[model samples]
Target chain A: MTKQEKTALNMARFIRSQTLTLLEKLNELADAADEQADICESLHDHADELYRSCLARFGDD
Target chain B: MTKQEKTALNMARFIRSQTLTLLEKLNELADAADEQADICESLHDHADELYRSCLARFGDD
Candidate 1:
C-alpha cells in the first residue's frame, strides 16, 4: 500500500479506537456558538471520509 | 514510526497535495446548510490537528 493507503487503513483503525475519546472532546465544546464548532463536531465523520477518500483516491478501495 | 504515527505524517503530505482539489470540492458544496458541511469544511484543519495529535499521542512529536 502507498503511504496514503496506509494512512487510511491506519487511521480507520486508529480513529475507531479514539472515537470514544473524540466524542468526549466534542462534548467538551458545548453550546459554543458552533461556528468553528461545526468543524469540530464533524471530526469523526470527516475522519471516515478522509479514510474513504484515501482508499478511493489511492485506488485501494 | 508506528502505523498511526505514519498515518499522520503521510496524511500531512497527502493533504497538502490534495488541499487544492479539496478547496475546489468545498466550493462545489454551494448553499450547503453546512451541518455536515461544517465537518466537510474543516477537513484540512482537522487533518493537520490529527497529524499533531498523532505525533503527540505516539510520542514522536
Candidate 2:
C-alpha cells in the first residue's frame, strides 16, 4: 500500500480503537454499581484484545 | 456470540465508524485548497468501505 493508504488505515484503526475507549468509559460508570461488573469488564477486555488481534493478523487489506 | 458480546462488537464497529466521520471533517478543511483533494477524498471513501467490509466479513470472533 501507498503511504497515504497506510495513513488511511492507521486512521481507521485509531477510530476503531475509540470503541474500546467508549466501552471502558461505559463500564467505569456501570461497574460502580452493577453486580455483573466483573463480567462486563471481562467482556470489554476481551473485545479490546480481539480488536488488537484483528489489527495484527488482518490489518493490511 | 452472546448478547453483550454482540453489543460489544456493535459498539466497536460504531466507534470505528467515527474515524470516517473524522476523515470527512479533515478533508472538509483540507480539500479546500489541496490539489490532491479528490485523491484524498477518494482514499477516505476507500477506507470507509474497507471498514464496513471488515465488519461484515470478519466481525465474529
Candidate 3:
C-alpha cells in the first residue's frame, strides 16, 4: 500500500482503540460533577456528528 | 440504569463514532507529509495501546 494509505489505515486502527480509554477518562471526571457528565455526553455526540461528516466524504462507513 | 452507567454508554458510543473522523483528519494531514504519515501511524498505535489498557480494566473488550 502507499504510505498515505498505510498511514490512514494505521490511524484508523489507533483511534478505534484509544476511544475506549478516552471514554474511561471522561467517566472518571463525570463522577466528580453531574453537570460535567451531561457536558461530556454532548461532546461525545458532537464527535459522532463529525465522524458522520467524514464518512460522507471518505465513503468508508 | 444509573446515571453513571448511562454516561459511560453514551461516551462509548460517541468515541466509537468519532474515531473514524479522527482517522480521516490524520490521513488528510499524512497526505501532505510523508514523514508526518509515519508519525501518524505511531500515534495511532499509541492510542490503541491506551484503549487496550482501559479495556483490561473496563472488561468490555
Best by lDDT: 1
Clashing pairs in 3: none
Estimate, for each residue in A23-50, the C-alpha lDDT of model 1 and write its tens digit: 4443444543223234434655666765
What is the per-residue lDDT of model 3 for residues B1-61, given as tens digits with 9 covering 90 to 100? 4455445555555544445455555557544444433443444344344334334434553
Candidate 1 chain B, poorest ten consecutive residues by summed lDDT: B31-40
lDDT per model vs. reference: 0.47, 0.45, 0.46
lDDT of 1 at B25: 47
Span of ten consecutive residues with least summed lDDT in model 3 chain B: B46-55
Ranking by DockQ: 3, 2, 1
Model 2 lDDT at residue B29: 43
Point out the worst 10-residue segment of candidate 3 chain A by lDDT: A46-55
Per-residue CA lDDT of candidate 2, range B1-61, in tens?
4455355446545644554454554455463324333433443453344345434543565
Query: What is residue B23's positional error in candidate 1, in angstroms?
Result: 14
Ten residues in sequence with the least summed lDDT for candidate 2 chain A: A31-40
Q: Of the pair 2 and 3, which is ahead by lDDT?
A: 3
lDDT of candidate 1 at residue B40, scale 0 to 100: 40
C-alpha DockQ of every model: 0.08, 0.09, 0.10
RMSD of every prediction: 11.1, 12.8, 9.4
Q: Rank the models by lDDT, top first.
A: 1, 3, 2
The CAPRI quality class of candidate 3 comes to incorrect
